[model samples]
Target chain A: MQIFVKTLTGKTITLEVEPSDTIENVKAKIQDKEGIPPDQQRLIFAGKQLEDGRTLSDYNIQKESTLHLVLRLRGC
Target chain B: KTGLHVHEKIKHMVKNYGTMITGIPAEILGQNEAEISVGYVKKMGNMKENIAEVVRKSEMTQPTNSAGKASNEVCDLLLGTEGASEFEKSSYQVLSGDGSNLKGSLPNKNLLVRVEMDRFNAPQKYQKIKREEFNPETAEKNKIYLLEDQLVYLDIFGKVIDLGQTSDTCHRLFNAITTPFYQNYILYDEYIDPEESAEEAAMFEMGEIVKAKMKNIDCWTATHSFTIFVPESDSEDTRTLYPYQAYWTSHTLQQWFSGDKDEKLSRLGIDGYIEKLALLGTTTDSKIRSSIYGELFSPPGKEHVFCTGMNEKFSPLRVKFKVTEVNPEIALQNLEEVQEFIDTNYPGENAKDQCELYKIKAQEAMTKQLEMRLL
Candidate 1:
């Protein structure tokens, strides 16, 4: 399945992958782009954790799925 | 004869954060007596919390976008339809080529801010300051010492005690004012960083202090408390900024480096540097760096001469230093040697390392001759 991934800095990229690819796969790709640590990289699609070992199909992800990546800031 | 420093620090902080001046005290006096008044807290801006933004942030990898995405798009992602957008990763090297150490500058300047405490403006004084102690069983009893015209509400641990009567309330009031006053802002900083490493370091820190303005008190809670008191009517505080400085950054290594430009590499930092240096051993960049700053900070076994930066290859610059004599002439002589060393060791044999070699050789020649460290 093909999907669109968006970042907080407002940049977007397109990726084509197998439907069986788990959320973890997408997270790795994100870690590559966002410069955030792998552990810091969180992937959520449709209110559920799109983690590794679970493909897009497992979560009913459709074509052109959009994922959001945010950098956390701590302290007031 | 009370000194006024905390009041001055508070005034400075609120101003820096962009507080507006609503009114100033109209006093016709000389500079020494001139009372320059400014706003403390303003209720103008929207004080409401952004709940939706917070909720969305907690759920997603990235929260808000530069360009607004529709609720429908967010709904779709939550509904598992179309996935969120993805982008190229930001290109910032966290570690050196060795991959064992951080690559960034340390912090230099101190960040200082203070809270105001005055005897006249204390919350409670001489009547009855109610106390509530928590236990597995009974209701607690406490003293009542409150003064007149204090609008402050002191929350000791978790109970609100009226303290508007005692004449000596100045000691407790100062303790109370600085306690909860900084609690919210401190917690307000937690979870600021998305990275778990940084976030883990930013966990909640809470404790207790006494109550009353300009009152002096020394007490501990749970053996883990930061209780300080300013005894005079206008006591001031001076503290190091390291603890709370860079309180929420993924680039802490960078922050630390930038903080103290003169501090030598610590044992912990050095170990990581060597490890990362080892990792850089395989890269071409590592060879270039090692050839340049090989003795960076100092030669091996040289006291006060510790190297920083991984393998020295990843970074475009290399640094090597030695202390021959503390005098300017000796330092100059040593510097000349360093320049000659760079000239000969400029990686002239290899084309790949030539560019950096030339750049670094020039840098070595321009360094300062010498300085004496004052004990």
Candidate 2:
């Protein structure tokens, strides 16, 4: 599915994710695309954190849909 | 234990009394009032602005760092002691004590209560407050990205490239035509010699515009407000040159989420000037575009009549294409395609596409200038 992933710095990147991919695995793919450290990856939707254990199937994201990827901002 | 404890309690009470008399918050103590400044959210905080102000003040005025320190300084000068050295030295020093008790005697017990705020805060309240302290306008919230080792100053020139703001369409056309040169060379607020012929400006302007137009589309994809500042001397001389300041200063995640006038932005001590400068770049972009549209973009089929030149007699007339649609995304894509087209068709291998696009327009403008002169 088409999912739009955007970084905290306003980089809106789109990706097609398969239904079988879990949210955690999706996080890895985002990290690969945006060059964000794996540890700094966060998938925020509806003003809440994405459940670490949940998968795409678990959350009901449609195919060809874009998930916005937000990079975690380190508050100094 | 009883006497010592009593003495300690009295000392503490006296200290608290000082803060109370001066109307300082007990916790932060005589500090600037900072709450979640009413009616705004995502606006860092009054506290953050207060701290930023304190930092600036500490650099200028001494005995700063916290609200607590600022308050104590107030007390020191008011109720002077034996060796009141550092606190007494600040500007606007005030002495507090009872009325005169005669020569060689301590100040009388009557504290100078006229300083008591008379009519500010209404009742229902801390009555011992006597009167409410006047609260100053809160400071702008800011972050210090990195401490500059050297003092930083920006020789900024503020200008809007709008046809509406200028004298007429011709001037706007000139501004648009020479936008690149103006960006790179001409300082803001510096008047162009009205007597100087437009042809001279056009050549350099095209060079400037073309160079900037060619900077990789990737370079501008993430930016909202784009500007270029070159060193004044370097620009004037055309000798060894260095760009003084050039960057896209956007603190946002999306362009739609961009232009945060509500967000507490950073500013130096110069009275809201920097904030004004920041707002001007993008805030006025639309207004300028609209003016251009009214003048150049209007009419049934004349929507694409984009003209760039100075005055009527001297202006170079170049092909005006109607901008079908534009945004960061579409502009970037079009720029790349245009860049490629120029690269394939034009000669000279060194990133000549943007240059060729510029030169073609310059030639057109030049030809128009000669024809007008002949006519």
Candidate 3:
């Protein structure tokens, strides 16, 4: 399936993905595409923060699903 | 992926399923108020009883489309069925992988909009839109089903009261799910109106605090009785409330025989203290929202709530008020989150109202945040 990762600043990056790919795997793909660290990226789809261990199929992510990529702000 | 196709593909996507408006704790509301305002009940929303159980969503095994019915004739939708009039179970992966149409024709349910509440009992994968937001053309454009306001009427237990019931009936449905007066409860015959008030008392598996601007006329009928039947999914018959109607009526009668309906209800019990209800403006902006400090109070010189399951036996009846409020910082944070959410999820889409709403909300939150900065 093909999905989109829409960043907080309004940039949409389309990626060819597998339904079985874990959220962390998708995060890595985003890092490769946009240089965002896996620990710093949180993907919210269908009103939930995707768990690192969960698969796209587990979240029932459909074809052309648009996910919001939020960069976690770790302010000490 | 950067063309009209991208635009068209996103048009099919069901983005922004739910919201984050209820992050604040439900209980302990209105305990601290700079000022207090209380009034008799109004109507409630169309929420029905027996809510949460409306639809028990399950796994994604249900295949909504029959696959592999490709036409030998080249069909095009624009120039008339060229390769295939309507592509089914189709994916870019199939076209790219091994240069073959291997997974092209498989069972698919991609277009189906699966709306359900989250673990926090919030809606997910579906949106709760207003009446004006309901556009049949737009709904068909997005391929999402419209349950309409029928989905709004629900009880606290997540039990759905029938929407087909009358308006007067709808008022009772919302009343049944909510509290008599939020954190405070009335002791009619030495028994609390709401059996399980985890927010005010202790901990429990918990339920929802359904809110509605609409209310019932007979204060005694809907106010004091939040009694509901426990369904099989969330029950074992360990106990039950005096059936919904009978119990509600009995409580109302007690208030009726006690005289001074308004005064008896004015003073209410909190944990066990006695507090007089303050006069308030009639508006749906909010009710039962305490102060920024998260507390409710009585008028000056007037005695506040009593303790240990004790309250004025013939004081004023407890009423509705705008004691419900969220912390400025939390509200600001939630507003910022929503701003970023709208920026990404529905960017350049057809949600003009949603975008405009965020702009207004963000402005209000930003102002509120700065207001507290002086301290």
Candidate 4:
């Protein structure tokens, strides 16, 4: 499956993955593609933070579904 | 490498990641200040509870992006997508490198804007002052007590230019102001990158005192632009310029000179440094590992302390120091180092399993230590 992720900075990258792929897996792919850390990356879909343990199908994510990626600023 | 690229990268980062301006010592400023103004909170006493509350409430109030979620590609400039880190991973090495032999001369002097505070009161004072029209009467009523009616920028020749309170400058200024009033430590953010331009580069910093009169209150200083430059060539004397060299150089210098040394020492406690060291070691970039290594040990008055005019105590330097009872490093070692130590210390048929067992034991030991600290 293919998903479009948009960074707050307005940069969008197309992520190609499987329906069985977990949010954690997507996070790793984003981390590999972008320098953003996995833990720091927050995926928001339908105005909710995408859970890491769940699969893409769990959220009913589509081929072109957009997931807003919000990076948490460093704490401490 | 030029002004356009550097500024473009900054704007991109700001838009995507959103700048995180947090107080150095999170303990001083309580919850509200840390979340809104500073933008990062480490310890929440009950992090789980706080996260739940923020998650529930933030969705309703949080601002959303324009053009709906994701419409179409607006620009091709993607951050961290160029297959390279924004700055040199070996930034520590560049910072600690030899200065006298360097090719880039410090032609443009960085601007330093100072704001004075009379009392550590509520946020209303700053909020009100920031919103009102620019004038002396409004400034007087604000009671946050800045020394100047408006911040001024300086050129290489030290000529003063009026720094108008635009939304960008004022936002940064207000954030800097909130630092010392709520926390004992000083905080500053890179208002302008020294590498980008010499004409208008600046930084915003706030400490405890100013003019020797605003004692016990926070004093905010904004450097319009610093005169620190890096070589832009490949020659032995020429070094590639890194963005915000001026800001980082000043930060390191000021932190060493006036920042709490004991607090720093504690902050660099064994566990933290080891964790940092281990993390750096795990990186594929050897240069980055070297830089992090240099940063771990660099102190003031060393070669790492590059840049002139840093020693002059132009403003009152405040130091907040406290000592912790434990030496945190006694049991803390880098994960790799610990694994190696386990191999050498406990040689057996199932050495890996033994190491894993010790790791579990180590966690238990750490837990006990924390519980003891509570007592």
Candidate 5:
């Protein structure tokens, strides 16, 4: 399966994944591709945060669907 | 307890009576109406001094923190009177929830992140993404990220009027021109020098067209207005899309959501505003105007400037006109002319690229800019 992920810089990247892959797994892939740390990634789909433990299918995020990947800015 | 309670109730009734008297029919009040109104004014004036004295005494007595700052923060806390203060800074606590659901959440430090304004003052981040590749929903979702700490002065009505995220000089200039409103209003060419020029001439002609169509309207507001939030780029050398291109991209999103012709036209003015800046030679002005426009997402940036949530993007251009009729083609043609002129006159290798990007983006935009939906 494939899903489109929009980065904070407005770049859209397509990822190949299995339905069994958790959002944490996807974040790891994003971290590899975009260099964004997985912990700092806040994945939002259908206006809900995509928690690390949940499967992508749990949220029903379909192929070609876009998820907003907002960076969690930790202040000094 | 009985006598004190009785005295308080009487004072409340007397206070209500003063307000109630003003509501009484003017005709019923008749000849003494002036005297009654005058009496209310005098009473308020007398109370004003008492309020000032109270405020002064409380300020003097307010407990100081180790840093010599007022620890109470709020007036009621210092006074310990158990009443709401008329002038208290509004704050809110951010709950961990969907941002879309957090309507009426106050813009405060604890709940919201504070963004430094000086960051935008740096060299322009030329972020040019292809118009076809741009996604409006994605851009809209990320808008809040750019707006953190940008609010300087929010009025009683909950309108952000001052450019707080920026510098004092910039704030002074912004304050000089516009009043407090949910959104600020300015004539499209408010700051543009109307000195005769080809671009100015074209702008005036276009304004006439907008005027004829939008007769009787003073200003059109941005449809989904807010402050401009240009995303930061890791590489300053990267070329982002021009304002017009980004406008095209976002406008495409609105169309996808079933936006009408009027809705798109309302957001189209930032392009014209930027074109105006380029015309006046202020596009490169190192002074306040250039930086202000830069932050607003004009030519120097990769996105469209923000406006009132309810305003048309192009409202600034046709401030004198209400804009009932729209010709997306004319706007396209006007941009073509301006871009070509800038390409020829503006001396820089990147300048031509900028104009080329604008033309491609806007021409592509024309295909979608006029296509309106009724639903």
Candidate 6:
């Protein structure tokens, strides 16, 4: 299925992946396209965090669903 | 009886007038909210997000270990004031069980061990995998292991084992699990001498790609992002230097999770302003926060700058952005303000010079876009 990634810099990426693909796999795909490393990416969809170990199916992400990407933010 | 009476009245005030009724400080409001949150969950609330947001707020706003404590308090308060803390423990102990289920009754099942995954600076995650079921022949790939501590293991399928009778597979999995814990300690490798030097300058002209390489071992790479630099008075050594802020492009999405426009802007500036100098959040780990002092990840033992959690077998880094159309005017304005901010707050002409370089690049990028648009 095709799902979209809305990146931190407001660009969009369309990816072809299976439901079994883990969140880290998605991050790897994003890294292959974007210079941002997987560890640096913080993905969110439908107000929930996407854990690297979990799969798209785990989150019930379907075709045309969009995931938001932010930098793995840190602070003091 | 009066003691119980005051407790009831306090709960009543919290549920009714809330902290606004006075006598109780604002801190108790969190306690009230937690109770209400539990009450919401008691009826099988559909909005788990409501609880999450409240939790995020409490965690983000408070410097203390409030969120975790509040959760534990909530879990216990539902049962206690008497022994809710114990209640919290029993919930775990009850689930862990007597080990009879995995060891005897459910002999057909595998022991699902909770194994930690890899990460840097942030909290790590765990995955439950059947220990005996691991395929080492294929799984012995893509990992950077280091020595670690802690031994008492957890398993998803309530498993029991008499220590001496532990299987060889269990030993292998336990050893494998301890390694790849991938904490910040990878930076603390034995060699102390600096790895990178002046001949191989960390300098890169405005737009260039870069990658990470240690003095000997290798795995991952990092590219230039608004770039990394050394201070003027500071020595030429790479270890002494701190990286400058990474520049996230000034692009805004249409829907920012329903966050306020300015709130999003403040976080990611309108046309690219530096994020706050302090990257450490209020709720950051005291060890990491206090040790960090500012926005720099210390170089690994100075022999080479290795970022945490990066191991020997990873893919090369790639680029983002086909073309970002910048509002040149707002871009320059954002640059100018940050320039002034640097002058007023921190005394640094070097940073000002870098800001000027970005000012030119902002217009240059905008002009390049204009040329492309005409094409």
What TM-score does chain A of each model score against the native chain A? 0.69, 0.71, 0.90, 0.87, 0.86, 0.89
Clashes of each: 87, 15, 65, 16, 25, 7
Question: Tens digits of per-residue lDDT for model 3 on B1-375?
Answer: 112222122212212211111111111111100001011111253222111111112111111010000011101111122212232112222121121221222112111110000111121122233357554322311111113333333222222333243445334333333443432221122333344553223101111212121132111211111111111112222211111110111122122212322122223322111121122111121222222001222212122232112322221222321111112233233344544565564355555555444434433333333233322
Q: Candidate order by TM-score, highest to lowest?
A: 6, 4, 1, 3, 5, 2
What C-alpha lDDT, on a 0 to 100 scale, does residue B344 get in candidate 6? 50
Q: Global lDDT of each model?
A: 0.29, 0.27, 0.29, 0.33, 0.31, 0.32
DockQ of 4: 0.02
Give the better candidate number (1 or 5) by lDDT.
5
Q: Which candidate number maximizes DockQ?
A: 6
Q: Estimate the TM-score for candidate 5.
A: 0.19
DockQ of 3: 0.02
Identify the runs in model 2 with alpha carbons over 4 angstroms from their true place. A73-76, B1-375
lDDT of 2 by residue, B1-375 (tens): 221222222223223222122222222211111111111212345644434443232211111112112222222323332222332233221211211111112122111110110011111100000012211111111100001111111100111111112234334334343443432232112354434746335434333333343232111111111111111122322311110111111121111112221122211211232223323222334444333322321222322332223211111111100001112232233334433444454434553343443334433433333333332
- Local distance difference test, candidate 2: 0.27
CAPRI-style class, candidate 3: incorrect
Candidates 4 and 6, the one with greater DockQ: 6
Docking class of 5: incorrect
When 2 and 3 are scored with lDDT, the better candidate is 3
What is the CAPRI rating of model 4's predicted complex? Answer: incorrect
- Number of the predicted model whose lDDT against the real structure is largest: 4
Taking chain A of model 6 alone, its TM-score versus the true chain A equals 0.89
- Across B1-375, the per-residue lDDT of candidate 1 in tens digits comes to 111232222223222211011111111111101111011112354322222222222211112111112211211111122221221111222234453322222212111111110111122222222223222111111212222222223322212353243434433432343333332232224343425442223222111112332244211111000001111221122311111111112222223233332133223243344443334333445454344333322223331322234423332231111111012232233334433443355445543354344333322221111001100
Superposing all C-alpha atoms, what RMSD in Å does each candidate have to the true structure?
28.8, 34.1, 29.5, 24.9, 32.8, 27.1
Error of 6 at B283 (Å): 34
**Global local distance difference test of model 5:** 0.31
| Candidate 1 runs further than 4 Å off | A31-37, A73-76, B1-272, B275-375
How far in Å is the alpha carbon of A11 misplaced in model 4?
2.9
After the best TM-score superposition of candidate 4, give how far the Cα of residue A65 lies from its true spot, in angstroms.
1.7
